[PDB]
Structures are given as C-alpha cells and as structure tokens.
Amino acid sequence: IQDRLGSLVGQDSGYVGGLPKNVKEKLLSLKTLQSELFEVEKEFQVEMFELENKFLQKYKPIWEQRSRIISGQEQPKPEQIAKGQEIVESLNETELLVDEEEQVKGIPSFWLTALENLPIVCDTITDRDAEVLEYLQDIGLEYLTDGRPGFKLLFRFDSSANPFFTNDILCKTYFYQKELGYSGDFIYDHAEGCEISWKDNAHNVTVDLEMRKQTIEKITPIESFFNFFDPPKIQNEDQDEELEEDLEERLALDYSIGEQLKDKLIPRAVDWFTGAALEFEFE
Amino acid sequence: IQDRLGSLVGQDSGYVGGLPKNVKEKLLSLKTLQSELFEVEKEFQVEMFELENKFLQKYKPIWEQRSRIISGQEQPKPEQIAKGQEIVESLNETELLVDEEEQVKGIPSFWLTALENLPIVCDTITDRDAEVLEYLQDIGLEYLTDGRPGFKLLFRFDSSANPFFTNDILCKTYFYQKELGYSGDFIYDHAEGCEISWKDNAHNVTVDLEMRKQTIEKITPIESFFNFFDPPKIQNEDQDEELEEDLEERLALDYSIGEQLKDKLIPRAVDWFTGAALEFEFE
Numbered sequence: 387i388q389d390r391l392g393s394l395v396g397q398d399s400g401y402v403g404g405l406p407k408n409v410k411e412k413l414l415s416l417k418t419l420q421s422e423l424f425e426v427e428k429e430f431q432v433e434m435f436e437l438e439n440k441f442l443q444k445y446k447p448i449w450e451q452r453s454r455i456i457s458g459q460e461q462p463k464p465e466q467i468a469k470g471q472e473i474v475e476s477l478n479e480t481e482l483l484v485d486e487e488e489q490v491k492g493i494p495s496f497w498l499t500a501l502e503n504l505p506i507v508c509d510t511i512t513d514r515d516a517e518v519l520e521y522l523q524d525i526g527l528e529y530l531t532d533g534r535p536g537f538k539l540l541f542r543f544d545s546s547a548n549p550f551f552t553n554d555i556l557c558k559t560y561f562y563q564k565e566l567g568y569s570g571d572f573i574y575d576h577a578e579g580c581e582i583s584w585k586d587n588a589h590n591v592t593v594d595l596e597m598r599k600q601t602i603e604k605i606t607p608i609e610s611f612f613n614f615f616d617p618p619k620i621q622n623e624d625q626d627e628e629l630e631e632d633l634e635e636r637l638a639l640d641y642s643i644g645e646q647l648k649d650k651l652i653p654r655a656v657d658w659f660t661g662a663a664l665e666f667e668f669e
Numbered sequence: 670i671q672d673r674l675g676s677l678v679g680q681d682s683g684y685v686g687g688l689p690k691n692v693k694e695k696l697l698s699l700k701t702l703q704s705e706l707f708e709v710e711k712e713f714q715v716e717m718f719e720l721e722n723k724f725l726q727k728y729k730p731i732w733e734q735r736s737r738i739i740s741g742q743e744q745p746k747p748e749q750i751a752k753g754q755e756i757v758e759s760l761n762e763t764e765l766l767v768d769e770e771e772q773v774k775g776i777p778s779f780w781l782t783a784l785e786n787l788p789i790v791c792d793t794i795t796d797r798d799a800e801v802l803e804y805l806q807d808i809g810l811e812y813l814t815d816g817r818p819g820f821k822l823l824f825r826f827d828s829s830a831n832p833f834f835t836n837d838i839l840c841k842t843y844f845y846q847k848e849l850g851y852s853g854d855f856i857y858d859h860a861e862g863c864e865i866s867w868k869d870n871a872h873n874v875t876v877d878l879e880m881r882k883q884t885i886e887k888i889t890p891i892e893s894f895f896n897f898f899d900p901p902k903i904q905n906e907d908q909d910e911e912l913e914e915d916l917e918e919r920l921a922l923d924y925s926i927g928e929q930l931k932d933k934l935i936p937r938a939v940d941w942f943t944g945a946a947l948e949f950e951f952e
Contacts, residue, residue: 391948398786398944403764408772412738413765414753415745416776416939419735421756423728423936430724437720441713445706452702455695462698470697473704481686482696489691493699503681568949570936653706653853656699661681665674666851 427570435572439529445653446526452655453524453542458492479662493659497522500658504651507643510611515591519611521548527652535572536561539647550589556580556615560644574641577617592616614643710853718855722812728936729809735938736807736825741775762945776942780805783941787934790926793894798874802894804831810935818855819844822930833872839863839898843927857924860900875899897926 402413454460462470467487474482498519502508511519521544528538539558543551557580562572584590587603592613594606618637624630650663657663685696737743745753750770757765781802785791794802804827811821822841826834840863845855867873870886875896877889901920907913933946940946 391951394786395944395948398947399762399764401782402943405776406772407767409776410765410767411745411750411753411771412776413939413943414757414767415749416735416738417753417756417762417765418749419731419738420937420939421752423731426724426727426731430720430727433720433723434717437713437716440716441709444709444713448702448706448709452699455699455702462694466698466701467694469704470694470700473700474697479682479700481682482693482700484690484693484697488694489689493688493692493695499684503677568937568952654703654851656696656703660685660696661678664681665678668674669851 424566428566431566431571435529435535436531439531442527442529449524449526449652456493456496457523458490464488477662479660482660495520496655496659497525500651500655503658503661503664504646506639507611507646507651510614510643512591512608512610514608515611518548518550518591521550525647525652525655527648530559530561534561534564536575537644537648539644549585550591551582551584553583556582556612558614558617558644560641576620577637577640577644579615579617582612582615614640707849711849714849714854718812718818719814722814725810725812732807732809732935739776739779740806741773747771760945762943765943778803779938779942780808783934783938786941786944786947787929789922790894790929790934793897793926795874795891795893797891798894801831801833801874804833808930808935808938810931813842813844817844817847819858820927820931822927832868833874834865834867836866839865839895841897841900841927843924859903860920860923860927862898862900865895865898897923 402410405413451460455462464487471483471487474480498511498516501511501519502516523542523544524540526540526542528540530536530538537560541556541558543553543556545552545554559578559580560574561576561578563575565573567573582592584592587593587605588595592608592610594608595603596606597603617640618633622629622633624634651658654663654666657666685693688696734743738745747770754766754770757763781794781799784794784802785799806825806827807823809823809825811823813819813821820843824839824841826836826839828835828837842861842863843857844859844861846858848856850856865875867875870876870888871878875891875893877891878886879889880886900923901916905912905916907917934941937946937949940949
C-alpha cells in the first residue's frame, strides 16, 4: 500500500534504530545466522528441483499416452473407456458419459480448445492464429538440469500437415536467476524464444501482409499468440519510461503465461478442454 | 465470479456434451489417464514432504542458535557480530549498524515484537496477552512423519519465570487430509490445540474474571491470542448457518495464521522483529 510500509516500516526501522548497543549487536548476529539458513535453503531448492525432474519423468509416459490418444494415433482400450465413465459420473461430469461402450480421428482442436479456456493465454490467440493452433499436437515440460535452473515448453506440431510452418517443435525457455528469492524460491530471470520457420510471408501469423504497387509487399508486426516465441528484449537499462514500464509488463505477462501452461494446462489438459478445470479450481 | 463459471463452464460443459460418441470416448480415457497421473502425484508429494523434513533438520541447529541468542543464554561471537554489520549495510538496514564492535540480557520481547509486525496474528494479541507473550522463548516447526502428514508449532516458554502458566511448551497441530488437492498439494483437514495450564483463574488470559458476592467468581470467555491453542470444534454437520459460516471462517483464519508462522515468521524471525520482513516481501 506504499504507505503501510512508509509509516509501518518507518516506526519499525525506528524502534530497532533506538535499541541498545548491546541488543543491536545480538540482531547483527541474528542477521548473520539468517545468511547461513540461506545457504542451506539454496541446497534445499536444488534437491527439490531435482526431485521434481524425477517425477516429470514418471509423468512423461502418461502424458505421451494422451498425446497419442489426441493424435488419433492410439485408440482407447475399452478398459480405460469404462473407468472414464465411472470417474466422470463420480465427478458429476455427465456431459462426458456415453452409452453402451464399444467419424473423426482422435480428438480435434484439443490443444486449441484447452488453451481457449485457459486464462491469460486465450487473449493471445486470434482467429488468425487459432487456425495454426489447429495443428498443435502436444505441449510438454522439461526442467533445465545441466546449467542454470529453469524450464522449457515444447509445442510439438503436425509438421507433416502444418500449412504455416515446417517446424516440428517450437519451445520456450525460462531461466531462473541463481540468486534465490527472499521468499525462498527461484526467481524469473530471462526467457528465450524458440524461433519459427513460416513457409510463407502470408502464412506468417505474427505479421500483416498488405501488398501495393509503384506488386511489392509491406510487412507489419501484428499482435499474435506466436509472439510467445519471441519474448521481450533482454533486460534493458531500466531507468526510463515506456522503454521500461511498457516493455517490462509485456514480460510479466509472458512469464505468467508460461507458468499457467507449466502448472495448470499441462498437468490437467483434459479438464482445460472440458472447462471442468476452471471450476475444479474454485472448488 | 459465480457467473464466469455459470455461463463459462456452462457452454464448455455443453460443447463437450455435444461431441461425438467417438470423440467423447477418447476423453473418457483421457479422464482415466488423469487418475493415473494422480496416483504418481501422490508419491511425489510424499518424497517432497520427506525432503522437507530433511532440511528442517538442517535448519533446527541454526534456529536453536538464535533461540539461545534471544534467550541471552548464548552470546554473539565477534566474528558473527561483524558479518552482521556487513550484511546489514549491504541490505541498507542502517538502523542495525553499531560502532566500534566490542544492560539487558539477550533481546527482550523478540517473539512478541516479531509477532506484532506479522500480519493476521497481530490482531489476535491483546495487551492482556502481550504480557504473557513476553515469556515466549521460541517458536518451532515439525512435520508429522509417523502417520497422516501435517505439521506442528512449538511455543517454548520461560517455564521458570512465566507468571501465567507452568507449561514448558504449547504446540499447535495441523493435519492435512490424505486426499490431495486438485491443485496437487496437501489440503487442510483438522487442527489440534495443545492445552494450557494457567496457574490462576485470574492469570487466565483467555477468560475474564469479575467476582461478585451474594465473593464467588463469574468467568467469561474473552477473545485472546492463546485461543490459538483451542482450534474451532471438529467439523460439524455443515448445512446450517452461523453454526457454519461463522465457526467455519474462525477456522479459515486459524489455518491461515499457522501457515504465516510456519512460512514467514519462523524462517525469517529476525526480519519480522525489525519489520524489515514486511518490506523485503513487496520487493
């Protein structure tokens, strides 16, 4: 509240300011003991990040399974099919129930549909790029072990049928800073955008093509979802205004989005498709 | 927003409702694959809770050290004393600086002072019980390994000088439910209050004593901080109103508080004393 810290921290920093040499000293050492804790808390975070990658491994198999179901590449074993009905009824998701258990292949626009129902990331998609997101085959995680910690998002596309770009995978990379938060956990530092190979300038969803004659073309940067693969410029000399406040919050959102896919979308993709996810959260 | 889920989840649960038998089925299995993930995610939480207890161990030593510094039981080694000054300047906490490094013993009302500057928990303290909190020697953590997971808060008091109660330690116990959240982590379930042995009915801060004659005394339950050691009644048949909404949020706060001590106060007690903590967070 800018004030609840100008007045509060004020008297506080004052009270302490007035304490005896004697007492003051004790705190000085307490402040030292704090930095010791800190050194431990760093190791903690390390074994945690590891422990996490450990289970990412145990999930991958499952997520790949669904990747294939959605692809239409693998079919549902009746056994699974039933359990789902049982589960779905249990969760009162009746819209999913189907009669006497045993058209299209797999489940169309799963990722497009799921992302629509996802907060912040639905406002980045445009009809223009929603067409391109038709070809999004799966989205995956990967923690950066070798080197500075961070994670990565892997958008595997239908290379063999994708009209806009020949790429097989587009990823996103986030790097936390070595320094830990006061809170005690990793802090966002830098983000890298796994470039895109649009076959056509026209097919380039991130840009606008209006051709004139003097049939030369004029290109114009559009606001697209695929701009996610071109994070905001590496930290600039803060100081200034719109050269900061502006290109600074574009980043804040970019970090926020990546965290949504990493924490909600990927772990519960089915539900984000059904919209069930949205609710399951308020509950 | 109650509506952004009545209209949203509505069309969503509808779209899905209209999908083909074919497609519907796929999701039914996806829904099955989800419950598999779930079984893994439980193990994850387990190795995590463990990993956490592992480091709690590595912290204990340090925290005990400060416990003693605050007690006045152990003195600050000049080496620590300096580092603190170095640290404090570095963090621009000048009020802590003291001149030529080498009255009262240790550092008085450390825990009382720290708790004051702590959100929600400062509103529970009353002049009445702030006197009793003068004797609070330390506050500690402990994860429940043997059995259902949860944690515990250990308030060690100055038994040898405490006027109000003879107890050596008052604790608080929180038990998470075996079932995990949709979010993926532990959920609050039940809270236990480590009883208090007030020497005097008068000294009983949690109650009010107004003696009349007919010199018999009349007792009246006051709103105290030490009520924290008598959590809200074990889950009652929800249904009703103030017998619910009322004694339900008294709980919500009680769980919230315990999480504040566990996550902020204990890990950064020095700062909560200086008030530095408050700020270090907005930053």
